[PDB]
Design a protein around this nucleic acid. Sequence first.
RNA 1: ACACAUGCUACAAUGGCCGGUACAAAGGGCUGCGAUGCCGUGAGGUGGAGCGAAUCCUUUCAAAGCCGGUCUCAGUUCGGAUCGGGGUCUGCAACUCGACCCCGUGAAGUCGGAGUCGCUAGUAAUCGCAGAUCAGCAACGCUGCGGUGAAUACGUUCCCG
Lengths: 116, 181, 78, 66
Amino acid sequence: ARLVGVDLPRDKRMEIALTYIYGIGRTRSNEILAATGIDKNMRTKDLTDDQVTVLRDYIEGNLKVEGDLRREVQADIRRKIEIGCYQGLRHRRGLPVRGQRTKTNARTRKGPKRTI
Amino acid sequence: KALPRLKQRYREEIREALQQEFNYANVMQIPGVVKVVVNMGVGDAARDAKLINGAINDLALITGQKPEVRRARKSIAQFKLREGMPIGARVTLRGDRMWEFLDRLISIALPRIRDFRGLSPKQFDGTGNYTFGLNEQSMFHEIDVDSIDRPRGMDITVVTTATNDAEGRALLRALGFPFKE
Amino acid sequence: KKGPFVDDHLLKKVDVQNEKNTKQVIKTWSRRSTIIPDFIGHTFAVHDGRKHVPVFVTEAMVGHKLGEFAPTRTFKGH
Amino acid sequence: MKTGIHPEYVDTTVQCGCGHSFTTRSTKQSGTIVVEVCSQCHPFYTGKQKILDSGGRVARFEKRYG
RNA sequence: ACACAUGCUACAAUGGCCGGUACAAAGGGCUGCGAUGCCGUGAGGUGGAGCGAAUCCUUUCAAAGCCGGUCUCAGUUCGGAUCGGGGUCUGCAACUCGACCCCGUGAAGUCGGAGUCGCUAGUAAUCGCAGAUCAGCAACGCUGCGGUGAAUACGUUCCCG
Ligand SMILES: [Mg+2]
Ligand SMILES: [Mg+2]
C-alpha cells in the first residue's frame, strides 16, 4: 500500500515488503518493526491505518524519506564529481571509483560489453 | 448544500480579499473562475486505437461529465497521424461541477502526488489563466490503483476573469492552490 | 603506534577549531600530517609552494598526504 | 446533462488519522473514504527534510574524526 | 574502447533465512597466540590466568550432515558486483595504497552454441580446516588434511602419443 510514495507487494511478509523503499530493506525493516513493536510474519494485506502512520512517522524521525535519500545520493555524486578528485574522474569516465581491476572487468559500471 | 464549498467560501471570503487587495472601484470587475478545461494528453494513435477508450474512462470518474474527443486538425508526416483520427479527449467544467472538481482536486489530488513539492506560480499566461498538469496518473481516489494499466497524465487549465497574471495569482492564493517561491 | 609527524602546530589548531565548533577553512603549512585521530574532517587549505586550494578531506583520504588529492606536480603533456 | 451517460454521483465523507473531516460529491457509493492524506500537507515538512539532508562537509567531519 | 589462460560466485526448491544439534587429521605461537568479563547488530576500544612448549584461541574442534518455522518455484528471501552513508585490524603515511563490518542501492546470470578439459575406488563430486611469506592484506590461488561419498568399464574398429 501507500507508505511513503511506493507500493508494497501483494502477498509477502513485512520484512520483505518494506524492501521496496529506497531506504529500507530486510534488516532495516526488521529493526524498524522490532523498535515499533510490530510482528514481521504478517502479510501485506492486513495492515492498519494507525500502524501505517506510526511506521511512517517513525521512519521519518529516525531515517529520512526515500526521495530524500535518492536526491542526496545524486547531490553527493555530483559534488564529488565537481570538486575534481579521483572519484569524480572515475565517475565521469564511467570507471570504478574504489580502485579495482579495469583491464577487462568493470563491465557492471562501463555498461554492456562493447568492442570497437 | 445549495452551493459547493468552494463556491460558498469564494462568494464572500475570496471576493472581499480580492476587493481589498485591488481597488477595482466598481462591482462586477472582480476576477472570477470562468471554466476549467481538462485535456488528456495522447498521441500514441496510429499504433494503438484502444488506449483512447481507457483515456476516456479515466477522464470519467475524474470529471462528472462525458469527455469528448478532438480529431486531428492536420495530418503530419514525421509523427504518424491522419486527418480524422481521435487525438485527445477534453472536458470543459463550469459551474457547480467546476467548483466541486476544483475543491476535490485541491483537497485530495495535489497532496497525493509522490514527492509533492507544490505548484509553480509562473505557469500563468498573459491573461490571468492558470495551467498545470498531472504527470503520470491516479491522483484522485475515484480510480482503483489496480484498475489502471498504464500511466496517462493530463493537463488542467483554469480560465478565470483575471485581466492580469498578478490578479490570477492573487485569486489562486486566496483559493486553496499551494504555490512555492 | 609511536609519536608520528603530527605537526603539533596543526594539531593544536585543529583541537581549538574542534573545541569552538566553527566550520571554516584552516590555512595549513605542512603536507605530511594526516595521522592523529583528532582531525575531525577539518578542511585544510594546504600550501604546495604555489597557492592554497580548498579541498575537504574524506574517509578514504584519511592517511594520505595532505596535498595529494589533485596532482601536485602539475603536468599533462598536451 | 443527459440521462445516464455518466456514472452515479453521491456525496462522500473523507476522514484522516488526524481527525480532518471533508465532504464532497464523488462516485464512491460507499460514501466513506479513509485516506492517508487530506488538506494538511506533510510535504511541507518533507521538503525541509529533503533540504536538511544535504551537506557533505558534515559527513566528512563525522565519519573522519581522524 | 578490447582479446586469450586459470580459479571463485552463482543461474535456483537435493534451494534461501532463522532457532536447536555430532564426530575428523593437520598447527600458526616470544615483541606472537591471547579463553572468562565490561559494551557493542560488528570488525572490535579495556585487557590479563596460560605458553621455546597441552592448563590458552585454532573451542572440552568446524561445514555438508539431523529437527522445527517460513518463502510457493519468481529475476525472487537465489546470486552478490558497481555505487552512496555509518566504522574497524596493521603500521607515521590504505582514492592511485589491502582486508573486514553495519544500512541502503539490487545489474548480468533462466546451466550456455562452434570448440574443448579432468576423472578407473575412497577416484570423480561436494564441504570446510590448516600452512609457505607479511606489523597489513589482493590468496577465490599453490600446497597437505580429512567429513559424506556415486554410475560405466562390449572392446581397441577408432582421434592423439
Ligand atoms: Mg496528509
Ligand atoms: Mg524462473
